[model samples]
Target: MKLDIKKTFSNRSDRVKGIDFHPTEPWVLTTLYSGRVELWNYETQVEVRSIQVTETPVRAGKFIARKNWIIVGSDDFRIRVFNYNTGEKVVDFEAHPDYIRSIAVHPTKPYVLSGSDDLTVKLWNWENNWALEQTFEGHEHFVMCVAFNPKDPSTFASGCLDRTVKVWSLGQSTPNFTLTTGQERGVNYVDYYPLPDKPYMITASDDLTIKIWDYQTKSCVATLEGHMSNVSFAVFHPTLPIIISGSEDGTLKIWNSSTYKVEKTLNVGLERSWCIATHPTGRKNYIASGFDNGFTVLSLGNDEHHHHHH
Candidate 1:
């Protein structure tokens, strides 16, 4: 399919730290280095709501299922749960000693997972009023990314500045498996394969490459290379054999998951692309990317063009 740049906009004075699209709406939530969190209706290109998350940078904000709520983490060492519809703060607490860099909401449970500069990952039970469920310590440096397995609720993964990715199980304090980058370059983000029973994990890194690993066999199965700078974020399409990655070099690349090849590259022309999100089912054929200077929502051109190539 052909890719068309749809809409582009800037939110605050500083770079965007993260961006997440709502599951059921044409809405997106963005966190910025200026300590701002704003919700935008991408369909209308209008701001729906804005909130100040901290005096410092706010790195992550995620929607909790279909609850009309948001969980945000920041450099202030705190995490807050907000009622997005009412503009009310539902819960707030000091979650880490240093910057909170990532938040991973469970796909099927009330649990929320977070990673931080404090070098620890914590699991919280929001169903019971933010009860601390478990604290996982393993990363030697700042934890940059964390994600829960979509099909296996008890399993989760974390990538850190220490150049390692650690996989953990719910009831255990130690990591069930540890995958190292084996160099000086740090891991910027990590994600799981979407298919149930798929035992693979993907990592984006400062090492300037994306690696797909077979967790069970503990081996690097495929390495995707193309990004000129640090690969900041990588994610799988919900139901397609595709992976999308954003990099510090200011471009988003869509990869053919099976072939591990770049299928498309969308340049934002900004200095750095920090994050990206794809339409859940590829029904919209759109990809939203957040960059250092601004953000854009790109519409995949047309299926006919893709079919012609095939």
Candidate 2:
């Protein structure tokens, strides 16, 4: 699968912290070290608009329930909501005590979720001026990533530098389960398997392995190992038994869920890659990855076809 390097529109003097494709549009948005958020056409990769928020770098961004709206979290401890069309601020507030790491919008709700260097994950009511609805705390270190359960939106799981993963049950307003990699180090990222029918969950750790957990059994079913350093991010292919992961060693590896083996490795450059996201509307099996260099898009092609001819 070859990705023609599309137009590179962001000219920030610093690195890009996060990137996300619109759920149902042709646009892609990125958060930058300049504390500015940029929107671009996915196909043409042309800059459509840019909004400046703060002197502190913008670390993560996402398109909201409304296709024309977007939100960003920054090192300034603020989350800014915007009207993408007008480049106007809808609402902005101090969201955390320290740098905000990542943010996710609820799959089918009006709530927004975020994690920060303050070692907490929070659920907020976006319409109520980003009012705090819940504060999730337990991790001894920073919460690096989080995902809402696909089957039950109220439930969520988070990965932290505490070398553990915790499953949060919203109805109880607390963590329902906890598991660890038993690594000498800590964890970096986690994702609930996208298929609601599957009982598996996946996480990447500084231990250089991806662990697949059986939610029903509470035990690790498989360990996908290949990365030489901290595995920073992992995303399950939306409708296939495939997974892709990026590492601190500057390599992205595609793996097979059934065989627990790496199929291909893409050496993207000599920089650490921090995040990865699957396309929302689910057309091409494309992935968007954020690195210290810039964002790169790759096509997983298809699952059953099994072509490594690249």
Candidate 3:
């Protein structure tokens, strides 16, 4: 599979924190350390709109499935859901006592999850006026990332500065299982395996490693090591046996998931890549990598040979 750089968006004044691709739209939402959240149309390469929701940095952003709403987390210690079409604020609430780091939206439900420096993961029920459904307190330090299982709405995971990944059920307040990273540092990002029945999760960390865990066995199934510095983000390909990771080392690497071997490496100059996202539709061979300088859209070159049935 051939991957090529499609576009580089270089207008950001500060580092990018997170990127989320709209599931049914051609747009992408990105949160910036510059306190801005932008929606970009990849097809037109034009920014549709930009919102300055906080004076402090906006750290995370995600689109609510089947809704016109977009949720964003900020260093201002608040999470807000906005109407992307009208640029109007829908709901705003104090999510934590510290900076809000990550936000995750459920695949088939109205629930949203947020992770924060308060060392807790909070679940919000969107259908119930965005009420606090549950507060999961287990991590000993900053909570960095939260992700929902694609195949199961009831299960989700969180990675934290405590150097562990905790899997929790929506119906319970405590974690069902926890996978601790034996490393000295913390986890920067976490993502679940996209395919059904795969039962695996991947984590990026300050230990410069991307480890895959078998949630069923509660063990590290694959240890992928290559990044020279802290690994910031890792995501599984929606349909292929591939995983892509971004790092503070200033490059993004695509690995063969089965063999755990590096397939291709793309450098974003000397800037640190903070986050990465695969296209949600799974039809396009695209990878969006957010950096300290800006962001880039990378695409697989041969569509005829690379296309897959979703």
Candidate 4:
């Protein structure tokens, strides 16, 4: 498997802020600072169509459980839904009281969960034309990221600017667990690793470190340190015990999860490498990262799963 990098026309004045692979489509979707989202050909690297959203930076975007739809949360306190194939805007809803900070699509439900500065995580029913399904409120500060438990549709977790990580499930009135970082800073991102033997979660933060937590034990198992500034994104290898992170220090580092050691660091000699995503299915398994300069694709081992159906 190999990664092929091709430069397409950027959304000309918009900073490409978020990018997601179409669930089963051959297109790559990108959300920009100009409040527009573009669907591009994964192979040809050509922009096919662009959707002009409301006037606010797109904070997060994703292809829903159903591959035919795309949803994005913006700084405008809205989540805009779209038809992936036709590039037609579906339903843009007033989903949050403040700017939506992040969104995660549920694995097995016709639902979408979003976290906002409003200090709440709200769920939406897409099959019913973007209606409010449920809302979980408790975070003391801006909820920065949310993740659905792939093995269980009713469970999710969020990382926030309040220096805590909270878990939400179906039976709970509020949160099941709120893990505090005794650190002086906040956690920016939290995600669960899809490992077969030991399924666990890891978080990145302004403390410039990555901490792996045992989901079953609810205990901190490992801590990785290498970044000089805030670590913005941390993602685990789909099949291996490896993790990758993008930091404000303008570098991307690959870590061996078992050893909790940094293996390789990509120092682009720049700034603002804000987001990172792994290509689970592609010719070559690799990681895609967004920077202040632009976007770059990095090779992993084999990205055989990149061509998944949209």
lDDT winner among the candidates?
3
Report the CA-based lDDT of candidate 2 relative to the real structure: 0.76
Residue 183 displacement in candidate 1 (angstroms): 5.1
Task: Report the lDDT tens digits of candidate 2 across residue range 1-310.
Answer: 3222232232322456787887667667777777767777757767789877788888888888474688899988988888887878888888999988888778877788898889889899866756798888888888877788887878888888888888886646657887876754777777888776777788888889888888777798888887998898887777657788999888888888678888878876637777777777444655677777676666565442234423
Candidate 4: how large is its RMSD? 3.5
Residue 127 of model 3 has an lDDT of 86
User: How does model 3 fare in lDDT?
Assistant: 0.83
Query: All candidates' lDDT scores?
Result: 0.82, 0.76, 0.83, 0.75
Q: Please list the residue runs of candidate 1 whose C-alpha ends up more than 4 Å from where it truly belongs after superposition.
A: 1-13, 301-310
Ranking by lDDT: 3, 1, 2, 4
Model 1, 1-310: lDDT tens per residue? 3444454444433688878888777777888888888889877889999898778988988877467798899998899989888989999899998999899988778889999998999999977889888999878999999998777868999999898999999989999988886536888898888787578888998888899988788788888999999899888876556789999888888898888989988776767989877665554566677778867776664443133344
Candidate 4 residue 102 C-alpha distance from true site, Å? 0.7
**What residue pairs are clashing in model 1?**
2-301
Report the Cα lDDT for residue 222, model 2: 87
Q: RMSD per prediction, one decimal?
A: 3.3, 4.0, 2.1, 3.5
Clashing pairs in 2: none
lDDT of 4 by residue, 187-226 (tens): 7888887755776888998898888988777788888898
